[PDB]
């Protein structure tokens, strides 16, 4: 997921800009986004949210708007228990479990049901689960006493001012997520949100693994208030951003450092190349317009290529194998963009899979490691050119195996297929540097791959008067059997042709296709 909020001083017309850009699975049902518009005498909300949810999480109206990205707030702890004498060890003493006999029905293939007993055990930490290896684990989840999650979002996206928004945010009823805000007044804000328990010791890595469940020393009971979490409002850089990277470079120049917060709040791992691009795209440009802003969202640069090819190409050229030499010249002539006609892109991905791992997150191959001091220009270089060339040799074999050639057009293999619509793809993996994301699946018998995750709901808003917004939803607004609104937007996505989002009554009336009057019995 990506998120940008630009202050007026950084734009040409003086209006704030906001980008809603969540990346999620294209097939998981509970992750499916739905676009809607709600108008009432007292409020108006437009945006996307997961099906089944009564409130819009990615919302905006004539005055404000917000967006979310995943921050992975560690709000739950898994404790390894020490079982003994029918209970568990705690501070040198055997404590008893709290047991409860429950039961549930299980449907059989024939349609009938059977009753299955279920014993529910709990330690002082929480519910106990047994793993395959026999390890007894107790799960402690934070905020089980915060029932106002839905109402807090409602009050946030419906706020009349930044102050009311902040007051709502301060209730701490939404357990996770990075949240970015922007309004027509010109205020932009970034918040590392969530319900984080206060801990006496240990860094984030310690609290993410199995914590000893035999000591009251690790049993937290308090949580941090909004004031303790990383937040940025109207920074001097004139912009705010988050691409799932730790909250250490939400803007540029930064306004705080990792040492200003408990070391268990967020990791201090290297920022992905997509996150690095995000910072560069915003900090390097000025006098932004909505048009220019949208063009930037589409960037699909193979940043890893810029950090590796300089060293890889020369080394591959000395290899006697004419095919490796040919592959090197193919990569050398490439503009390093994930366009549809690219003939070197696929081969580069395959080399990258070996150089940096299947998820492209590996750091071991680089000559210069990542450093928070050069957050947008490291890591860099190839540590072992010779070894990198062996990997390229293998990559050539893997590319032919998967796609049938080392120079097949990127958009010929990468496709977006919904129902009867089949369009060429562009852009790719975020970890390779692509800002616009399409996480392509493994190819089929014929080397054809499709998005499994990536761009879903995409919207860019300019808080002018009246507001101006454009958007697109990859997989349509309906998934019911036989709907005509499942594959009717994938073509536009393919051409980066955004729809104007209609908020004004006259625009809506001019585009109406169906009218459903309704009577609600209060």
């Amino acid at each position: 997921s990506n998120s940008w909020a630009v202050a007026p001083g950084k734009t040409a017309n003086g209006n704030a800009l906001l980008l809603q850009n969540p990346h999620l699975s294209w097939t998981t049902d509970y992750f499916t986004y739905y676009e809607a518009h709600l108008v009432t005498p007292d409020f108006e909300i437009y945006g996307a949210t997961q099906i089944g949810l009564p409130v819009i999480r990615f919302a905006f109206n004539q005055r404000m708007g917000i967006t979310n990205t995943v921050n992975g707030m560690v709000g739950a702890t898994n404790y390894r228990l020490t079982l003994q004498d029918g209970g568990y060890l705690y501070d040198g003493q055997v404590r008893p479990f709290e047991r409860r006999q429950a039961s549930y029905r299980l449907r059989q293939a024939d349609g009938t049901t059977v009753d299955k007993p279920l014993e529910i055990r709990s330690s002082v930490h929480g519910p106990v689960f047994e793993r395959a290896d026999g390890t007894a684990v107790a799960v402690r989840v934070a905020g089980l006493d915060r029932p106002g999650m839905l109402e807090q979002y409602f009050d946030m996206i419906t706020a009349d001012s930044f102050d009311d928004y902040e007051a709502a945010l301060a209730r701490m009823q939404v357990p996770t997520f990075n949240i970015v805000y922007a309004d027509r007044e010109g205020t932009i804000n970034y918040s590392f949100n969530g319900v984080a328990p206060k801990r006496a010791e240990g860094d984030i890595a310690f609290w993410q693994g199995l914590v000893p469940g035999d000591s009251s020393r690790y049993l937290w009971t308090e949580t941090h208030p909004l004031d303790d979490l990383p937040r940025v409002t109207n920074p001097p850089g004139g912009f705010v951003q988050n691409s799932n990277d730790p909250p250490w470079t939400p803007t540029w120049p930064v306004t705080y450092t990792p040492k200003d917060f408990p070391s268990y709040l967020a990791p201090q791992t290297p920022h992905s190349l997509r996150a690095q691009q995000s910072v560069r795209l915003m900090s390097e440009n000025d006098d932004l317009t909505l048009e220019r802003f949208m063009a930037l969202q589409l960037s699909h640069r193979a940043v890893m290529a810029d950090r590796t090819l300089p060293d890889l190409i020369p080394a591959a050229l000395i290899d006697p194998d004419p095919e490796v030499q040919a592959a090197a010249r193919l990569l050398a002539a490439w503009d390093r963009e994930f366009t549809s006609d690219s003939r070197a892109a696929l081969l580069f991905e395959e080399w990258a899979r070996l150089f940096a791992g299947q998820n492209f997150a590996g750091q071991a191959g680089f000559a210069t490691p990542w450093s928070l001091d050069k957050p947008v220009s490291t890591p860099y270089g190839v540590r072992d050119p010779k070894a990198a060339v062996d990997q390229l040799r293998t990559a050539i074999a893997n590319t032919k195996r998967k796609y049938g050639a080392i120079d097949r057009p990127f958009g010929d293999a990468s496709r977006m297929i919904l129902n009867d619509v089949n369009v060429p793809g562009a852009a790719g993996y975020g970890n390779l540097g692509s800002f616009r994301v399409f996480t392509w699946s493994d190819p089929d018998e014929n080397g054809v791959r499709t998005p499994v995750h990536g761009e879903t709901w995409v919207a860019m808003i300019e808080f002018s008067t009246p507001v101006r917004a454009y958007g697109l939803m990859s997989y349509g607004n309906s998934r019911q059997p036989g709907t005509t609104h499942y594959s009717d937007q994938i073509e536009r996505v393919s051409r980066a042709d955004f729809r104007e989002l209609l908020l004004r009554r006259e625009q809506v009336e001019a585009a109406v296709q169906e009218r459903t009057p309704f009577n609600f019995k209060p």
Binding site: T40, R63, L106, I120, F129, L150, E151, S478, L502, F520
Partner: protein, 153 residues
């Protein structure tokens, strides 16, 4: 300077545009939530019903083995029951919006029974508690605490 005049609805109606995007106009909040539920049921009825069924801790009962793990995860973590408490603790005004939303989903299903997939009809009728339960499952037991991380799978 102030924003443009907001529209003031005089009747409840849903205006769908060329892309199946609903523009819901309600004379009050409850009516807006009712229309929203109706719209969601029409667009994603089957999956919403399936999700609500799971949030009740009845996934295994309704659909079998493939839904058993989640059922154990949700029951052991007391999700269905806590959703009842949370529902009971909603502010009077917001609870009314949650009920209207649920009523919208039931209404759509009742008026267009053949649009709802057979295997998911057994979930009807849904309620405001089902709505709270699903939100609770999604936030706390998917985004924050996922079963894979605990079960070690």
């Amino acid at each position: 300077q102030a924003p443009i005049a907001a529209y003031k609805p005089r009747s409840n109606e849903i205006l769908w545009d060329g892309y199946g995007v609903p523009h819901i106009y309600g004379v009050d909040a409850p009516s807006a939530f009712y229309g929203y539920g109706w719209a969601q049921a029409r667009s994603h009825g089957d999956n919403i019903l399936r999700l609500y069924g799971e949030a009740r801790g009845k996934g295994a009962e309704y659909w079998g083995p493939d839904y058993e793990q989640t059922t154990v995860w949700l029951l052991t973590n007391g999700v269905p029951e806590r959703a009842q408490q949370w529902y009971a603790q909603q502010s009077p005004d917001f609870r009314a919006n949650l009920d209207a939303f649920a009523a919208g989903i039931n209404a759509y299903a009742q008026q267009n029974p053949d649009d709802i997939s057979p295997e998911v009809r057994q979930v009807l009728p849904v309620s405001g508690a089902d709505v709270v339960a699903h939100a609770h499952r999604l936030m706390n037991f998917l985004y924050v605490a996922s079963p894979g991380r605990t079960l070690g799978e």
